[PDB]
Write a protein that binds this DNA or RNA. Structure first.
Ligand code: FES
Ligand SMILES: [Mg+2]
Ligand SMILES: [Mg+2]
Ligand SMILES: [Mg+2]
Ligand SMILES: [Mg+2]
Ligand SMILES: [Mg+2]
Ligand SMILES: [Mg+2]
Lengths: 96, 122, 137, 58, 85, 99
RNA sequence: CCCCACUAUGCUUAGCCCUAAACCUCAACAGUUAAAUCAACAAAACUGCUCGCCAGAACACUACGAGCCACAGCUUAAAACUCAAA
């Protein structure tokens, strides 16, 4: 027929879906260094997904891992471990 | 099933720690567990003070016992660890490596919800 | 170096000092700021009481106790007593969100005590005991 | 209650009171200016009037 | 049971106690502790708590959408290019 | 042998561009209001850019500028709206002049 | 209503009681957005099939009868007198 007519196909310019920083990586309650990245330095509160930036699945995994570590003696509850205060800041929140 | 016993033992000298680990692994074997590995996480100050057997512990030695035990042995092992005096705190979990991580394509965006209210003029 | 809002950690080597004293040795000023009162107790790092002052102990009574003015007066009195006992720098630990939460601190500064750190210790249960029923107003 | 001894503190209190009154007046002026906020509510209402929401079809 | 002078602690910089207290209050507010204490003064019944949470979530949605629209349209606050027509 | 509309669209430079995000285009200023420059870059909608501090006087009507397009049209659907709210202008970053 | 103190009670175990604005007052299943869209408001209008329910207000979550571990109870549930409204 007419060669210049459009053709049905998938979007070639579609950018790959953005992946959470923890996508594809195992979250373990023993990895207190990683879990401490998602808790408040001063109050120990677990940050929300709007702060962490994680997906729902990884947010739930982080939450359950933090609770397990706190109850099993791996992680403090009321504050962030001082040994992990200088770890990379992966949470979108500034207090000062 | 495959379980991982996370164990916090009282900070003791090497002979006492070795004896306690041997006793715990022997108890696991007696209850039927096949111990696969014993991993030492080192001795560290506890995140918070723990009062176990009328004694306040500030430091503890962290170990992991990966094993395969019948479902009925978990309760008995929990009771045994509760009765033990050298164990600050022992918790048996299902082995994290058992649960395979499903592949994630990426964060699928959520479009703004539509047609929640009738388009009649207000 | 750069100033850090995080306190120095016990067991770590820190160059910060106050009159030659480490952060673990600075006395502690506990300010319980209730909704109707403000109590300030100065204690040593080894937990030795040194001074005490509340809005009640300053001659304020009834609703007048739960004011910033009464808390400031209590802070001045407590700071004066602590300075009499040899206290210069203090770590402030405040619990409660009463009217005297901040003004009492000011009183200490007016009394002559330098605040090196401020800590909130307001008791926040993780859903423990059940508080009283809501008022109808 | 002898003012002669207390002159310095009395003057400090008076200066603070005058500063508070002048600062209240300046705060009213600033609110009229609207610099602190991203925009005044009136100008924002004008902007939203220019681009109204359309919860209906036409 | 935890260590002390680690949680909710802010170091004062050159005796600037005002700024230190402001930072501490900002930290408590952002973490939501202040609102939690205020709501825990008197018991909030579960139905009342659910109603408050629903109202606050709807308020958050509306406020975020309004802020997004305001930011989107703010570029159009510039001068009138076709004045007189 | 008359060219069809599909042929024209297929070979049009705008179609050849693909997505407009982070594409360098050449715009022409056609209107100036104080420090606002209204630049037409061949798209459906013009962009509005602030006059740069450097070489501000060098921007006049008919000037050719290098823009980095971010969107051909600024539209967004908001809470409760039935149609996308459009400001009827593009989004581009004014880099400078093209000689 | 406000403040203080305390009890039944809230908790555990073993039985009962079987009621809620038990409401998302919007039944289950399958399907449509075509139009003739559509009283009003609410959370758009519908179609096929089936079950349950409804038939002016009040009397009436009542009386009597019956059933229930319930004995100041719960379920089912009227009628007479009255009004031109609800
Ligand atoms: S982004 Fe892949 S699991 Fe969250
Ligand atoms: Mg009472
Ligand atoms: Mg209980
Ligand atoms: Mg209900
Ligand atoms: Mg009833
Ligand atoms: Mg009855
Ligand atoms: Mg009967």
């Amino acid at each position: 027929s007419n060669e210049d007519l459009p053709i049905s196909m998938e979007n070639p310019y579609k950018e790959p879906l953005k992946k959470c920083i923890l996508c594809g990586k195992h979250v373990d309650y023993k990895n207190v260094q990683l879990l401490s990245q998602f808790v408040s330095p001063f109050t120990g509160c677990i940050y929300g997904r709007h702060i962490t930036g994680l997906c729902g699945k990884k947010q739930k995994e982080i939450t359950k891992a933090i609770k397990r570590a706190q109850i099993m003696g791996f992680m403090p509850v009321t504050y962030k471990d001082p040994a992990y205060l200088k770890d990379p800041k992966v949470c979108n929140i500034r207090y000062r | 099933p495959r379980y991982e016993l996370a164990l916090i033992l009282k900070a003791m000298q090497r002979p006492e720690t070795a004896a306690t680990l041997k006793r715990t692994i022997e108890a696991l074997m007696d209850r039927g567990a096949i111990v696969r590995d014993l991993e030492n996480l080192g001795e560290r100050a506890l995140p918070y003070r723990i009062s176990a057997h009328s004694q306040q512990h500030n430091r503890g030695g962290y170990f992991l016992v990966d094993f395969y035990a019948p479902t009925a042995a978990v309760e008995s092992m929990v009771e045994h660890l509760s009765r033990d005096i050298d164990v600050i705190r022992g918790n048996i979990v299902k082995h994290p490596l058992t649960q395979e991580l499903k592949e994630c394509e990426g964060i699928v965006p959520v479009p703004l919800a539509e047609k929640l209210y009738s388009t009649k003029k207000r | 170096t750069k100033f850090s809002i995080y306190p120095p950690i016990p067991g770590e080597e820190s160059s910060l000092r106050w009159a030659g004293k480490k952060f673990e040795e600075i006395p502690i000023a506990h300010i319980k700021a209730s909704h109707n009162n403000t109590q300030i107790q100065v204690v040593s790092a080894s937990n030795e009481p040194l001074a005490f002052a509340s809005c009640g102990t300053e001659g304020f009574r009834n609703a007048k106790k739960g004011t910033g003015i009464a808390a400031q007066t209590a802070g001045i009195a407590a700071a004066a007593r602590a300075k009499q006992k040899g206290v210069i720098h203090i770590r402030v630990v405040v619990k409660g969100l009463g009217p005297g939460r901040l003004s009492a601190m000011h009183g200490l500064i007016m009394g002559g005590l330098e605040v090196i750190s401020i800590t909130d210790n307001t008791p926040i249960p993780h859903n423990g005991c059940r508080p009283r029923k809501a008022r109808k107003l | 209650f002898r003012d002669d001894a207390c002159r310095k503190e009395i003057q400090g209190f008076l200066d603070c009171a005058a500063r508070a009154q002048e600062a209240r007046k300046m705060r009213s002026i600033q609110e009229t200016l609207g610099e602190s906020g991203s925009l005044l509510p009136n100008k924002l209402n004008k902007l939203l009037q220019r681009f109204p929401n359309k919860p209906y079809l036409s | 049971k935890h260590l002390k002078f680690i949680a909710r602690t802010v170091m004062v910089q050159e005796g600037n106690v005002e700024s230190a207290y402001r930072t501490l209050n900002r930290i408590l507010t952002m973490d939501g502790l202040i609102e939690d204490i205020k709501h825990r003064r008197y018991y909030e019944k579960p139905c009342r708590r659910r109603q408050r949470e629903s109202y606050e979530r709807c308020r958050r949605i509306y406020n975020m959408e309004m802020a997004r629209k305001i930011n989107f349209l703010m570029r159009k606050n510039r001068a009138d290019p076709w004045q007189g027509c | 042998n008359v060219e069809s509309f599909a042929s024209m669209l297929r070979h049009s430079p705008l179609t050849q561009m693909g997505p407009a995000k982070d594409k360098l285009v050449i715009g022409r200023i056609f209107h100036i209001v104080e420090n606002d420059l209204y630049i037409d870059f061949g798209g459906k909608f013009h962009c509005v850019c602030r006059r740069p501090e450097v070489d501000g006087e060098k921007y006049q009507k008919g000037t050719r500028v290098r823009l980095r397009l971010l969107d051909l049209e600024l539209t967004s659907r908001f809470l409760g709206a039935t149609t996308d709210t459009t400001v009827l202008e593009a989004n581009a970053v004014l880099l400078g002049i093209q000689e």
